[PDB]
Design a protein around this nucleic acid. Structure first.
Ligand SMILES: [Mg+2]
Ligand SMILES: [Mg+2]
Ligand SMILES: [Mg+2]
Ligand SMILES: [Mg+2]
Ligand SMILES: [Mg+2]
Ligand SMILES: [Mg+2]
Ligand SMILES: [Mg+2]
Ligand SMILES: [Mg+2]
Ligand SMILES: [Mg+2]
Ligand SMILES: [Mg+2]
Ligand SMILES: [Mg+2]
Ligand SMILES: [Mg+2]
Ligand SMILES: [Mg+2]
Ligand SMILES: [Mg+2]
Ligand SMILES: [Mg+2]
Ligand SMILES: [Mg+2]
Ligand SMILES: [Mg+2]
Ligand SMILES: [Mg+2]
Ligand SMILES: [Mg+2]
Ligand SMILES: [Mg+2]
Ligand SMILES: [Mg+2]
Ligand SMILES: [Mg+2]
Ligand SMILES: [Mg+2]
Ligand SMILES: [Mg+2]
Ligand SMILES: [Mg+2]
Ligand SMILES: [Mg+2]
Ligand SMILES: [Mg+2]
Ligand SMILES: [Mg+2]
Ligand SMILES: [Mg+2]
Ligand SMILES: [Mg+2]
Ligand SMILES: [Mg+2]
Ligand SMILES: [Mg+2]
Lengths: 50, 80, 49, 115, 48
RNA sequence: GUUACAGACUUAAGCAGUGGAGCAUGUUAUUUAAUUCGAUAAUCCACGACUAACCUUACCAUAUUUUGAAUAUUAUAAUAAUUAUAAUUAUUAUAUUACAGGCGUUACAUUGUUGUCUUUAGUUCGUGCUGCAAAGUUUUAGAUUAAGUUCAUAAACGAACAAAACUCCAUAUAUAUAAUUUUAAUUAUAUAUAAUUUUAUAUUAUUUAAUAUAAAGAAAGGAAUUAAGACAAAUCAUAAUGAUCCUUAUAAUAUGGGUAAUAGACGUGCUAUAAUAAAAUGAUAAUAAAAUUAUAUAAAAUAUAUUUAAUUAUAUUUAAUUAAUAAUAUAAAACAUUUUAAUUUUUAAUAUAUUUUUUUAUUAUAAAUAUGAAUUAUAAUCUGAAAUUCGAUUAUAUGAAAAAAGAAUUGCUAGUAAUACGUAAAUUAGUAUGUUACGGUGAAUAUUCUAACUGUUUCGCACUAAUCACUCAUCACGCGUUGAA
């Protein structure tokens, strides 16, 4: 079902943004260590996502 | 609804009050089919800009109201 | 350095194209941070033998 | 009213929000909500066998239904951007936006059409 | 899409320990502050 | 507004067209309350837009929203989930400011991307060497290639981004797999191998290179890729961002109207102007490919248009399949019989006969059709809640112009052009004369002269934001200085 596939890839794209947002931390407004991350790659097996 | 079956197009209007007492019906429908139940009722059909006063004769019975309120102005050329 | 690969030039191994337009060995990317002056970006392109 | 644009409080879609997108989404939700009812009304209207008064009433009801109940009103927007021209259904994206995504490798199986 | 998707707001709810930073929001706030400073801030909204 | 060569769909042949007609569509102009905005020399003009009824839309008229789509701050209150009648959290409600929002303005602030030069052959970097040096050599004598492409020669030797090659499609062969009912094995698809073909005899010019001949091979294309720079080329209307402007309005929602207005004009197309060409028909259904079908594809069959029935169009109702299995869908030109006005180049009455779907004789048969399909009238049908502005069919009537088109001009060298040859999908609830794709049948022609435009080159150069360059004098405006008198 291609609708479902489209929905999945949308979800994946949205999660990527969320991950990017998470990646930057703060330490009591002293140090802002910006962890750089690659674009995520989502492996959709029948059983599980990775 | 154009097709003879299913027709004709009907819209809700303040018809009965107009029939009782001559108060014109300001329609913004333009796609309501005229009926035999309103010939001799004053309609004020929308033109996009301004509402257009019309008294529905018996020749109009088949047609739409928007057919009698011409939306565009009559074209001319400024010969310069 | 260089962006041609010489492993494909004289051997049985052939080059392949990712999405049918990027030589496998290449990997291209950009990221566009906003400045005080406005928008800018930073293309990077590595070869990897 | 003041607190919301449309009558019913619907959620915002995730990712790229736009005014037109918002308008479309709400409309789609209302269509989904009132799909069966509309169908039933249509059926009652287009019936040679049923009583005529009932069919007329159904037709009137259909006419009086709002802008957001209409299936025909729905327009497929781009999801990444908010464009509504050359919107491909197989990846709910606009033409340029689709191409951009495709070349990046975002699409699941899309690649350059070499022949 | 799925309207219930994780947002930056939630990333505080789920993981209070980690002091996250939403970069785009922070940038927007900085721009607003700059506008306020140089007399190009938004006019106060009418209520009536 | 220069020199010299070389190049190709540049020109020349050739084939089909445009330019005339009507229609479609885009543009212009003008109109309009609004005719939304952009694209507008090559490098705009079926372009952005793979479908403007409402929506989409951004425009206009009238209505009505004002923390609104977000994030955070500060408070009251209510409901639900979890725990062992209380509490913790999550949300919602009412407010509260900062704001949110802006297809508003500037691609002469930007990003990314794209067009043209360009699949053109250019664009540079090391170490060495030359020059006081900026620089030059490398990056070229001369030739050659499609080509900074190999030769060669050279103070050079290597190396990079381009070129080529690897890539994809298609081809040939091999292996594997398919219990040959998902079969098409004449296939599909993974993995290889294969060629930018090889060899030899001769004939011209200098060991090689072009022609010819021969023997060995399936061996012959297309696609993607379009560098640096430039054009302040296109885009702030995919999207994002700088600056700037709007904040009861330049933000937000509904109802209707507009984007479809029409004097002239300009592109692209479509249909035509009839016999090397149009129409009827063709069921042991002549012959394809590619692609779509859970926001569906709709078979058979019944009914009406229609006395048989077929065809075509609707309705009735869903068989099968979400697919190598069923459906869209018996491909169409082709080929065959029949007909065809202009055409007294035919018909029909007689005879006639070894041309009989026919012949001869004698009588009568006296510039748009039995071309074309614009325009309009009425009736139905389809989609949709809705078809008036403003959609698509079918029927019965209506039957304009147009007699192969002035100067000029467009595409194309082969499975190409051409085709009154059809087929599919993307965009839709609904409408393709457009777009993107598939096969079918399949040619004609050929290089020497000149315009242009790309390369590299000759000579010139007072230009270097580089000819939208630089630059000369009067006249006009002010403030000095020095002459004459
Ligand atoms: Mg729609
Ligand atoms: Mg010619
Ligand atoms: Mg003309
Ligand atoms: Mg013409
Ligand atoms: Mg325009
Ligand atoms: Mg412009
Ligand atoms: Mg065009
Ligand atoms: Mg509207
Ligand atoms: Mg607006
Ligand atoms: Mg702002
Ligand atoms: Mg740019
Ligand atoms: Mg050179
Ligand atoms: Mg040099
Ligand atoms: Mg078989
Ligand atoms: Mg190449
Ligand atoms: Mg370039
Ligand atoms: Mg520019
Ligand atoms: Mg410009
Ligand atoms: Mg801007
Ligand atoms: Mg603009
Ligand atoms: Mg925007
Ligand atoms: Mg407004
Ligand atoms: Mg238009
Ligand atoms: Mg003909
Ligand atoms: Mg046949
Ligand atoms: Mg059938
Ligand atoms: Mg089948
Ligand atoms: Mg005719
Ligand atoms: Mg005539
Ligand atoms: Mg015809
Ligand atoms: Mg063909
Ligand atoms: Mg050359």
């Amino acid at each position: 079902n291609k609708n479902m596939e489209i929905m999945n890839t949308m979800n994946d794209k949205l999660i990527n943004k969320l991950l990017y947002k998470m990646m930057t931390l703060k330490l009591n407004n002293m140090n802002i260590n910006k962890i750089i991350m690659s674009k995520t790659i989502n492996q959709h097996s029948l059983n599980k996502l990775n | 609804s154009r097709s003879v079956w299913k027709g004709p197009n009907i819209v809700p209007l303040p018809i009965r009050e107009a029939m009782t007492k001559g108060t014109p019906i300001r329609t913004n429908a333009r796609a309501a089919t005229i009926l035999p139940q309103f010939v001799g009722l004053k309609f004020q059909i929308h033109n996009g800009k301004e509402y257009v006063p019309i008294e529905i004769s018996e020749d109009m019975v088949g047609h739409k109201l928007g057919e009698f309120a011409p939306t565009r102005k009559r074209f001319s050329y400024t010969q310069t | 350095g260089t962006f041609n690969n010489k492993k494909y030039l004289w051997s049985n191994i052939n080059n392949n194209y990712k999405l049918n337009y990027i030589p496998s060995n290449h990997n291209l990317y950009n990221n566009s941070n906003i400045n005080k002056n406005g928008k800018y970006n930073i293309k990077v392109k590595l070869n990897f033998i | 009213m003041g607190n919301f644009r449309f009558p019913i409080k619907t959620k915002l879609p995730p990712g790229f929000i736009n005014a037109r997108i918002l308008r479309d989404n709400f409309k789609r939700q209302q269509f989904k909500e009132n799909e069966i009812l509309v169908k039933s009304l249509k059926f009652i209207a287009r019936n040679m066998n049923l009583p005529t008064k009932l069919r007329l009433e159904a037709q009137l009801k259909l006419n009086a239904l709002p802008n957001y109940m209409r299936s025909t009103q729905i327009k497929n927007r781009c999801v990444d951007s908010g464009h509504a021209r050359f919107v491909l259904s197989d990846f709910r994206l606009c033409r340029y936006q689709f191409r951009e995504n495709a070349l990046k490798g975002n699409l699941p199986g899309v690649k350059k059409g070499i022949w | 899409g799925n309207p219930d998707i994780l947002k930056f707001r939630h990333l505080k709810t789920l993981y209070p320990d980690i002091e996250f930073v939403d970069l785009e929001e922070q940038y927007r706030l900085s721009m607003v502050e700059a506008k306020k400073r140089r007399g190009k801030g938004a006019p106060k909204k009418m209520k009536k």
